[PDB]
Symmetry: C3
Subunit: 588 residues, 3 copies
C-alpha cells in the first residue's frame, strides 16, 4: 500500500476542449491476381548426341615374321593393319551373298598394297557370326585362326592372315553435326547427313569425292538370317583409310534438334505483372519468369522438333483433361524464360466463360524457380491473411467509437484520462469535452477519517470516506472527500441516508480501505481480493532461428569416381612406364 | 460548414424490431501433430565401384631389328609385346624366391613363341624395385637396359630383350560385377568373385578353365622386404593373353552392396497423415515422404550391407545419446522414400512412458526434401499463430456483446445506427429494439436561433439550440430543437434552469456551433478543436516481391573442363593427323 | 422455446468480492537487427586447370618393308616412331630459318639411331603449313608423301620417311603443378614453372639435366608470316624421348591460384548475432555464415590472386556506385563461410553518418545458403508483423478496461456473469463487486401470468411480466417477477404508470414473450425477430499442404551420356576383339 499517487483535480473550464478522432477510412483487400489457365510444354537445351546405327566393313590384315631356331620358334615381328572393304565388295559380295574375297587390296602409305589369306589364291570366304560377348552388338568374320609359316630350320619366314570383319555399331554425333564417331572410338570426318539429294551435298566432308558413294533403293540382307529387307533405304557408304562405314541417309532437319522436351504441364497458370509473365505449375512447384513478347522460333537453329512436340503434347493433354470443360484460345505461344527454358503455352477458357539464328543456353539448376514458387506461395498467403487482419482491426476501432462516446457521458474523468494519456478532470460542454490537468499528491500526505456518519444531522452519512491531506510535506491541512480511483475532492457533499448492513471497499493508494456500518475497519492490498480478468488472451510466439547446413547426395568427387576408368589416370600411369622400368638416357 | 447531412427521425413503433446476434461458437485450436521420436540411417543408391588390390605379372618382350650402314645405325623395326608369366613361375620362382626366368614362353597368334633375354641361355634373374615416381604404386623388374645386336657392317640383325615386370595395381568393378579393370587400363573378363568354393563357380568368366587357378593357403612374400605374410589367403590367378593377374578371393555378398550409407540422423521425427509417413530431421533440414508399408530388404539385390550398417549405426547413436533417457521400441524398420532414399528407422520411447530383385534409383538432388522441410516448418507456425488469432478474435467479439447490449439502453439511436448500418431512430420495447429510418435534410435548409433563453418563463433555458428548417428547398418552415449528431427534433422540450458561466459546443453540419450565456457566438470547423484518439494503432505492411536469379557454384561446362585430359578431344585431334600432315589419296 | 435455463438470484453479500485485473505491461517491439553495409567478392575453390600455349617439335620417322611378288606388292611391316628435334635444330634451323634437317638422329632403346629421308644425303627442308582442319591449332611439316622403295621383283626392300612436324598446342596442368599434358594426350613430367632463375629450380622434374634448356632473350619467328616477335621471352625447351616441347617461362605465384572469383556483390549486408556473422545479398538471394575471426590469407596455398582480384573488384564497384555517398571503413577483411566460400568484405559508411598452408574445399551446392536467405527473409517479416499484432492486442485489452469498469456500474449482474464465467448476481460495494451464484430452474417449472395490470391500484402496471415457478418438479409454487435474461425475481416491485400503445417483448427461455396493453399475446422464437450483428468478421484460412516432387534439369545419366566418346566403353569393346573374332587358346 501507499505507493500509488493521489490526485486533486480542479473543475474544468472551456480553456481546453477535446474531441474524439472520427472513423478512419479502412483499407481495402488488394485485388486478387488474375490467372490465365493453360497447358504447357517446357523445353531445355539439348545436351544428348544424335544417335544412329552404322555398319563397319574392314579386313584385319596380319603379317607375322617367325624365326625358327633349334627346338624353338620366335616372332621377330607382327605387323597388324585394318584395310577398308571396297564398295564393289560390300554391295556385290557381302550384301548380295554374305561372302568376302580372301584378299585385301588397298592404299596405305601412298602405295597400293595387296594381301592374300595364307598366301594362297583368291577365294570367296563365308561370313559367320562372331563369338558372343555380353553387352556387345552383332558381328561376323571369315576366319578364327591366325596363319603362321611352317617350320624351316634356321630361316626367317613370313605368313599372312586376312580376316574380313563386319560389325553393327552405334554411331554418335554432336552439334553442328559435321562429323561422327563409332562405338570402336573411330572418328568419321563427314556429316551423318551428307548426301547428294535435297541440298545435303552442302554438309561437311573432309574426304575426296571418290571415297563416298550413295545407293538409292538399297535392300539390306541380314548376314545371320539371310533374309532381305522388305523396304528399301538410301544407303551412304564411306571408305576411310582404315575401314568402310555404311549408314542409312535421312534428312537433317527432322532428325536433330537443339532443344529437348523436358516437362509436360497440364495446369500452367499464367499471371502478368511488372511487365513480365509468371508461369507457375502447382504440380512441379515451379515458377518461370518471361518478358511479355513471344520468342520467335525462327531464331532457334534446327528447332523443328519444338513446334512438332509442343503440338502433339498439348493436343494429347487437352483431350485427356479438358475436352469436356474448356476450349483452346488461339494457337500455341512461345516464351523464353529466365534460366534458358523455352515454354510452349496454350491458353484455355472454361465453357462457362464462353461469352540470325542462335542456341538457347539452359542452366543446370532449377532451384531458383522452385524457391520463386515457394516464396510466392507463402508471400501471397501471408499478405492475404495480414491484409484481412488489418481491415478487421480498423473496422473494430471504428465500431467501438460508439461505445467510447457513450462511456464519456457516464464518467468523463476516467475516459478523458484514458484517451488524453495523463490524469485529468473532465466535463461535457455539450458535444465536446473540457479538460484540466490534475495535481499529484504523495500517498504519505493523506489521512482518512475514522467515520462516515454526519454528526451534525443524524440519519445521514457520507457516501465515500472523509479525507484530510496536504499538497506539500509541510503546509496547511485541507479537508475533503475521497473520490473514484485516488481522487481527492475539495468538498464533503457526497451524502446518503444511513442504512443497516453497510459494507464498503474504497480504492486507497495501491490497495483498498474497508468500512462497516459507516466506520473504518482496515486497509487491504489488491492481492487480498479475488481477481477476475476482462482481457482476452492471445499467446503469439516468434518463429525461431534455423540453420541450413550444406547437403549433397553425391559430391562432385563421387561423381568423378563413379566412372570405371579415368582416361587421365590411365594415361599418366602408362606414360611413366619407361621412367619406372627402363633407362631413357644410357647409350651403348 | 454545411458539409454533412442533417436528419429528422419519427418516433419508432413496433412495426420493425431487431435483436443482436448471440455469441458465436468459437473455432478450436487444432490438435498438434503427433511425432514418434527415433534414430535413422538414410541410404542412397551406390555409384562407387568395388575396389580391391591386384598384382600383374608379365614380361616386356622386345625384338629390335637394326641396320648397320656406313658410320650410322638405324632401327628397321621394334616389335614390342607383353607375355603372361605362367602359374608355375609366379608360385615357384616369383613368390618363392623373388626371381624370374630370363625367357618368355607363351602363346601368341595361335603359335608357341619363345624369347630369350640377350639371346643367351636361360637364367634366373632377380627382381628389384622400379625407379620411384610420384602417385604410383609399387613395381619391380629384372632389367633396365634394352639389348640391341652388336655392329656388323652392312647387315640387318635382331636382338631380344625380356624384362620380367611385377606391379601392384588397383582393380575396379561395377555392378553386376561380371568383369573388372586394372589401373593400367586393361580389362579382365571374369568376376572378381569367381572361384571354386562356396558356389562361386557360377560367377561369370569368359576364359577357358586352364587359364584360371586358385591356391588355398597361399602366403604372399613381399618382393622388397623378403618377408612372408603371417596369415594365408585364397589366391586367384588368371593368365590372360597379355599378362597374369592375381588377387585375393573373398565371398561376394559381404563385399559389395547396391546401397551406400549417406546420413546418420540421431533425431528423426516420424509423423503420419494422409496415408503416408513424414520423416523429418531438424539437423539436416530435410523431410522424406513414404508409404505406410515397410520396404522388404529381400527385394534389394546384394543389399546385405543395409541391415549390417543400420544396426551398427543405430546402436552407436542410441548408446551415445539415449541410453539414459529412452528405450528402443521393436527392431529397426525399413521404408522407401520418394526420390529413392531407403530409410532404416528405430522408434524410441521416453523412460517416463509405457506405464524377383530390384535396384533402387536415387535422384541426385535433395532440394525437393529441403523445400518440403522449409515449407512445412513455416506453414505449421503460420497456421498455429493465425489459428490463435482467429480464436482470440471470436472470443473478443463474443465478449464485447456485453458492452453493446448495455450501451443500447443509454443511447438506442446511436447504437441502432451503428449496427443496422444506416441512420435510424430507435427505442427499447423491453428486450428488443424498435427502429425507424430517418429522413435526410440538406444542411442548406436549416437555420439556428440566436438564443436559448425561454422568454415565456425567465430563469429557464433550452438545453440544446433551437432550430428552424424545411424538408425541401422550397416549402413550409418547421420549428424544432437540435438533437445529438445532426438530429432535428420536432419538439422544443429539452429544458433546464439557466445558470451563469454557460459555455457549450454543439455538433452542426461538418463542424460545431458555440454558445455562451444561452446566446449564439460562432461556428467552428472540426479542425479548430484538439483531437484525441480512441483508436489503437496497428501498422501491418505487406511482404515485398522478390526475384530469385539462377545461381550455380560450378556450371556443367566448368565441371567438364575440370578434367586434365578429355578422351574425345584427344582422339578427335590424333585421328586428324593423316588428314593434316599426310596425303591419304595419292598413289605411286 | 422452453429450451434454456432460468435462474433465481439471491441478493449478494460481502462474503465474496471480486476486482478486475489491472492493465498488463505490454511487450515491446523487439529492436531491429543492425546491418553493416559493404561490398563483397565471393571466392570458390578453383577446379579449372592452369592453361598455357606450348609448341611441339618432332620428326615422324617411318620405315616400311615391302615384298615385291609377281604382279603385286605387299607391306611386310611399317615401323612408325616419333623422334625429338634437338635444341640446336629448334634454335638454329627452325626458329632462325624455318627449315629442318632431312635426317633424324636420336636415342631409342639405349641406341643412337639415325634415319635419312628417302635414304638420301642430308638437306634442309622448308617447313610449310599443314592442311586445314576445323577446330585444330596451327601446324607445319616438311613432307606430304610417304617414301617406299622401288620395285625389284622377288625382293624384300626397306624405305625411310622423315617428316619434320611442328605444332602449336594447348598445355594443361593441375595443382600441385608438378607435371602437364599436351593437347595430343602426351604427358610431360616437369613443372610448367621449372627454370633456373628466381628459385624455380626447386620445382619438380623427372628428367636429366641435359634434357632441359632455358633461353633468355628469345625472339620467336612465326613460321607462316616469317615475322620476328617484337619483344623477347624466356623460352623453356625440354627434349623427351618422343618429342621436344617449348613454352614461355613465367613466375609461378602470379600465374596460378587455388581460389577463383565467383560473385561480385555491390550490396552485401553484414549482421552479427549468436557469435557469428551473416553476410546476406539481396541481389543473389544468398546468406553466408562465418565465425567472427578473420581467415588469414597466409593460410591459403598459392592464394595471391585473392587479394589482387578482391582489391580490383572492390575499388571498381565502389567507384561505380558509392563514391558520391559513402566512404570505405578500413582495408578489406577476409572471412571463411560455411560450405567453403571465402568472402572478401569491404565495410562502408554513409557520408551522413561520418561523425602450414591449406586448401579450402567448396561444396558444389549453394542451395543451403539460398534456403537460409529465404527462411530468414520470411521469418523476419512474420516475426515483425505478429510482434506488432501482439503489442496492439495487449494495448487494446488494456484500453477496453475503461469501458468494462463503467459498464459494471450499469448492470453488475451481466458484467459479473460475463467475467466470472458462470451466472451470478452482483452488487457494487464501493469500488469492488460482491457476487453470489444464481440457482438454476428448469423451463418446464415456470408459468407466466396473463396480465401486467395492478388490480389493487388501477392506473399502475408492472414494468416486466409477473411469473410463477417452482424449484423442483414437485414442490411449493413461488410468485415472482421476470427479470433480465431469464432471471426470476422473488419480489413484484417493478412498477410504472400504465400508458396507451404499450407493446413489449421479453426474453423467455430460448425465445421471447410478447405483450400488448399490459396483457399477454404470444411467444416467439429468436428466428422470428430480425437479427443485426455487433461482430466484426475476420475470415482467416489455413495455408494448405503442398508436396514437392523430385525435379532435375539433367539427370546424372544424361550428363554422363552428353560426352561424345566414353573411354570405358571404347576400351571394354576394343579389348573384347580377340575373344569375339579370334581364338586365344588353339596352338598349331
Ligand atoms: C482481372 O480480371 C477482371 C475480369 O474478370 C477485371 O475486372 C473488370 O474490370 C473493368 C475495369 O475496372 C470493369 O469495367 C469490369 O466491369 C470488370 N469485370 C468484372 C466481371 O467485374 C480486372 O480489371 C482484372 N484485374 C487485374 C489486376 O488484371
Ligand atoms: C527480357 O528483356 C530485357 C530487355 O528489355 C533483356 O535484358 C537485356 O539482356 C541482354 C543480354 O543479357 C543484355 O545485354 C542487356 O544489357 C539487358 N538489358 C537490360 C535493360 O537489362 C532480358 O535478357 C530479357 N529476358 C528474357 C528471359 O528474355
Ligand atoms: C504460449 O505458447 C507456448 C508454445 O508456443 C507455450 O510454451 C510451451 O510450454 C510447455 C509447458 O511448460 C513446454 O513443455 C514447451 O516446451 C513450450 N514450448 C515452446 C515452443 O516454448 C507457453 O507455455 C504458452 N504461454 C502461455 C502463457 O500460455
Ligand atoms: C495423439 O496422441 C495423443 C496422446 O498423447 C492422443 O490423445 C488421446 O486420444 C484418445 C482418443 O480421443 C483420448 O481417449 C485420450 O484421453 C487422449 N489423451 C490425452 C492425454 O489427451 C491422440 O488421440 C493422438 N492423435 C492423433 C491424431 O494421433
Ligand atoms: C506408394 O504406393 C503407390 C501405390 O499405392 C505407388 O504409386 C504407383 O507407382 C507406379 C510406379 O511408378 C505407377 O505405375 C502407378 O501408376 C502408381 N499408382 C498410383 C495410384 O499413383 C508409389 O510409387 C509408392 N511410393 C513409394 C515411395 O513407395
Ligand atoms: C509503418 O511501418 C513501416 C515499416 O514497415 C514504416 O516505413 C518507413 O517509413 C519511413 C518514412 O517514409 C522511411 O524512411 C522508411 O524507409 C520506411 N521503412 C520501410 C522498411 O519501408 C512506416 O513509416 C510506418 N507507418 C506508420 C503510420 O507508423
Ligand atoms: C544498433 O545500432 C544502434 C545505433 O543506430 C545502437 O543504439 C544505441 O543503443 C544504446 C543502448 O540501449 C542507447 O544508449 C543509445 O542511445 C542508442 N543510440 C541511438 C542513436 O539510438 C544499438 O546499441 C545497436 N544494437 C545492436 C544489437 O548492435
Ligand atoms: C568456426 O569455429 C569453430 C570452432 O570454434 C569450428 O568448429 C570445429 O570444426 C572442426 C571441423 O569440422 C571440428 O573438427 C571441430 O570439432 C569443431 N569444433 C567445435 C567446438 O564444434 C568451425 O569449423 C568454424 N567454421 C568456420 C566456417 O570457420
Ligand atoms: C473465407 O475465405 C475463403 C478464401 O480464403 C473463401 O473460400 C472460397 O469460397 C468460394 C465459394 O464457396 C469458392 O468458390 C472458392 O474455391 C473458395 N476458395 C478457397 C481458397 O477455399 C470462403 O468462402 C470465405 N468464408 C466466408 C464465411 O466468407
Amino acid at each position: 500500500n501507499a505507493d500509488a499517487q493521489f490526485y486533486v483535480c480542479p473543475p474544468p473550464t472551456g480553456a481546453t476542449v477535446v474531441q474524439f478522432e472520427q472513423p478512419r477510412r479502412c483499407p481495402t483487400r488488394p485485388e486478387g491476381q488474375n490467372y490465365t489457365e493453360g497447358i504447357a510444354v517446357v523445353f531445355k537445351e539439348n545436351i544428348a548426341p544424335y544417335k544412329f546405327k552404322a555398319t563397319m566393313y574392314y579386313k584385319d590384315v596380319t603379317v607375322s615374321q617367325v624365326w625358327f631356331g633349334h627346338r624353338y620358334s620366335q616372332f621377330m615381328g607382327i605387323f597388324e593393319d585394318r584395310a577398308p572393304v571396297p564398295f564393289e565388295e560390300v554391295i556385290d559380295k557381302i550384301n548380295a551373298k554374305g561372302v568376302c574375297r580372301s584378299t585385301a587390296k588397298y592404299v596405305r602409305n601412298n602405295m597400293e598394297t595387296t594381301a592374300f589369306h595364307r598366301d594362297d589364291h583368291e577365294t570367296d570366304m563365308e561370313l559367320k557370326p562372331a563369338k558372343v560377348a555380353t553387352r556387345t552388338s552383332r558381328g561376323w568374320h571369315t576366319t578364327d585362326l591366325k596363319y603362321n609359316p611352317s617350320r624351316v630350320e634356321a630361316f626367317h619366314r613370313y605368313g599372312t592372315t586376312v580376316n574380313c570383319i563386319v560389325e553393327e555399331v552405334d554411331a554418335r554425333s554432336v552439334y553442328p553435326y559435321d562429323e561422327f564417331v563409332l562405338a570402336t572410338g573411330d572418328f568419321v570426318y563427314m556429316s551423318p547427313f551428307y548426301g547428294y539429294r535435297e541440298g545435303s551435298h552442302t554438309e561437311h566432308t573432309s574426304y575426296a569425292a571418290d571415297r563416298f558413294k550413295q545407293v538409292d533403293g538399297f535392300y539390306a540382307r541380314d548376314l545371320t538370317t539371310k533374309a532381305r529387307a522388305t523396304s528399301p533405304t538410301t544407303r551412304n557408304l564411306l571408305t576411310t583409310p582404315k575401314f568402310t562405314v555404311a549408314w542409312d541417309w535421312v534428312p537433317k532437319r527432322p532428325a536433330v534438334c537443339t532443344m529437348t522436351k523436358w516437362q509436360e504441364v497440364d495446369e500452367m497458370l499464367r499471371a502478368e505483372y511488372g511487365g513480365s509473365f509468371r508461369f507457375s505449375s502447382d504440380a512441379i512447384s515451379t515458377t518461370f519468369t518471361t518478358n511479355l513478347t513471344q520468342y520467335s522460333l525462327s531464331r532457334v537453329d534446327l528447332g523443328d522438333c519444338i513446334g512438332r512436340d509442343a503440338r502433339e503434347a498439348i493436343d494429347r493433354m487437352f483431350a485427356r483433361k479438358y475436352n469436356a470443360t474448356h476450349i483452346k484460345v488461339g494457337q500455341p505461344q512461345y516464351y523464353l524464360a529466365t534460366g534458358g527454358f523455352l515454354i510452349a503455352y496454350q491458353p484455355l477458357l472454361s465453357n462457362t466463360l464462353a461469352e540470325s539464328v542462335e542456341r538457347i543456353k539452359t542452366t543446370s539448376s532449377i532451384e531458383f524457380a522452385r524457391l520463386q514458387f515457394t516464396y510466392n506461395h507463402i508471400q501471397r498467403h501471408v499478405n492475404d491473411m495480414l491484409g484481412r487482419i488489418a481491415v478487421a482491426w480498423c473496422e473494430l476501432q471504428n465500431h467501438e467509437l460508439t461505445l467510447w462516446n457513450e462511456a464519456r457521458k457516464l464518467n468523463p474523468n476516467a475516459i478523458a484520462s484514458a484517451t488524453v494519456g495523463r490524469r485529468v478532470s473532465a466535463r461535457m460542454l455539450g458535444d465536446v469535452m473540457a479538460v484540466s490537468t490534475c495535481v499529484p499528491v504523495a500517498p504519505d500526505n493523506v489521512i482518512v477519517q475514522n467515520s462516515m456518519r454526519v454528526s451534525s444531522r443524524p440519519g445521514t452519512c457520507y457516501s465515500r470516506p472523509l479525507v484530510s491531506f496536504r499538497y506539500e510535506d509541510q503546509g496547511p491541512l485541507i479537508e475533503g472527500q475521497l473520490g473514484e480511483n485516488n481522487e481527492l475532492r475539495l468538498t464533503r457533499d457526497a451524502l446518503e441516508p444511513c442504512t443497516v448492513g453497510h459494507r464498503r471497499y474504497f480504492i486507497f493508494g495501491g490497495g483498498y480501505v474497508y468500512f462497516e456500518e459507516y466506520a473504518y475497519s482496515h486497509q487491504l492490498s489488491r492481492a487480498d481480493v479475488t481477481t477476475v480478468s476482462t482481457f482476452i488472451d492471445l499467446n503469439i510466439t516468434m518463429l525461431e532461428d534455423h540453420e541450413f547446413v550444406p547437403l549433397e547426395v553425391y559430391t562432385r568427387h563421387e561423381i568423378k569416381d563413379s566412372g570405371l576408368l579415368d582416361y587421365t589416370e590411365v594415361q599418366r600411369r602408362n606414360q611413366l612406364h619407361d621412367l619406372r622400368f627402363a633407362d631413357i638416357d644410357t647409350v651403348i
